[PDB]
Design an enzyme around this catalytic site. Sequence first.
Site, mmCIF file in Angstrom:
data_model
loop_
_atom_site.group_PDB
_atom_site.id
_atom_site.type_symbol
_atom_site.label_atom_id
_atom_site.label_comp_id
_atom_site.label_asym_id
_atom_site.label_seq_id
_atom_site.Cartn_x
_atom_site.Cartn_y
_atom_site.Cartn_z
ATOM 1 N N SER A 10 2.261 -2.064 -2.852
ATOM 2 C CA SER A 10 1.579 -3.333 -2.616
ATOM 3 C C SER A 10 0.033 -3.095 -2.696
ATOM 4 O O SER A 10 -0.517 -3.651 -3.445
ATOM 5 C CB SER A 10 1.890 -3.772 -0.974
ATOM 6 N N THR A 11 -0.422 -2.116 -2.021
ATOM 7 C CA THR A 11 -1.869 -1.808 -2.029
ATOM 8 C C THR A 11 -2.004 -0.297 -1.768
ATOM 9 O O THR A 11 -2.620 0.505 -2.397
ATOM 10 C CB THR A 11 -2.526 -2.475 -0.762
#
Lengths: 183, 183
Positions: A10-11
């Site tokens: 995701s990040t």
Amino acid sequence: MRLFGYARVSTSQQSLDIQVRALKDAGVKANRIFTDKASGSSSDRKGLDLLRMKVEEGDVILVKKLDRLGRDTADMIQLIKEFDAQGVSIRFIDDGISTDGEMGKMVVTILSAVAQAERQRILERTNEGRQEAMAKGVVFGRKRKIDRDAVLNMWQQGLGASHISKTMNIARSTVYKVINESN
Amino acid sequence: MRLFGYARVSTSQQSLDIQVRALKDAGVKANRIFTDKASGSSSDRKGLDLLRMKVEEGDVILVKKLDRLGRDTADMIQLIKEFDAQGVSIRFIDDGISTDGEMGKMVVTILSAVAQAERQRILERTNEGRQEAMAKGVVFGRKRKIDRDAVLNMWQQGLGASHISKTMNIARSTVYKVINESN
DNA sequence: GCAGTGTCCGATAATTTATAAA
DNA sequence: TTATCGGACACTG
DNA sequence: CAGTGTCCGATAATTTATAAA
DNA sequence: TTATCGGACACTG
């Protein structure tokens, strides 16, 4: 043969490293490894895309876990089916799930099934739940906020649609619409 | 060895017969079929608790599809784990899937692979807002409802906790919690 | 010598964050 | 899903 | 042209569900 | 995750 490794996060660039390093442990070629971030079955596929075109038949893609192949379990399944038809085998390191060997065919067929079911389970519940919500009178969509009464008043007072828009700060379409829609 | 059948039913008895018919068309003896109307409300499963008892190692249970043997994936996981250890196997007719010996283990592995996988994905995504917003300062949790000012007033008025709760329909404990929050 | 008083947890409850559809 | 802009596509003047 | 009024695709904001904290 | 509820202990008037 050509061994590849797919990672996605995701990040957390950190969570990505962990994957990549675990991938290298078996597949050393970092040029072959294709990572991704900004998860999204709606638009994110780039890294995977470079993988797709490079991967010929008899190739093995190494992933860390099921949750690293596609954003939605649906997406993941889609890819699995894809690479499989092209003759590429996906092997999930940790889960010990592989799409090749004798298991292969069955593993995929099970995969598609457990997934097939869940998709329905959640859909059924959404439909079922939206119905009741509707029966209860629950209103869906954007909650009206335009001061429809105001638009109507001014209009009755010989005002022009344009003015009603310019002063209220709304689109002429909604102004005309408010008037036109009303009975 | 025995050939048994099973059917979880959606809605009720009307949907049932269709499933009980398919199993007959499959070959299960019309009396060796076990059905369960999806109670939903409680975890009971009478027909199933019978099957689980009549089966002895070697038997075979036939069922239309995965989601006709269990409620949530987790139910299937252990439910299958049970039938397997007991030497019993199950065949998902319209899925080809069979827990035949070793396969049994493979089926469950997928089930718990996809379940935690789908879980991780979802926590993965919300994780952004969950931390970002949390740090940002958004207030998390249930909105406060008890009228804290009135509560503290009655208390400041000399009224005991038992009175406050009674008078404003609040939980007596809450009277104390509210009193302690910052006081 | 029967309700009240506090201090404390295990249940429900409610809400937030994000995405998919609608 | 439903509401609201955002213009585009004409028309009379 | 520029004052209207019309119609429509492209955004917004919400509601249900999912899952967890 | 935070809010309230429903009771539980162990006493206290």
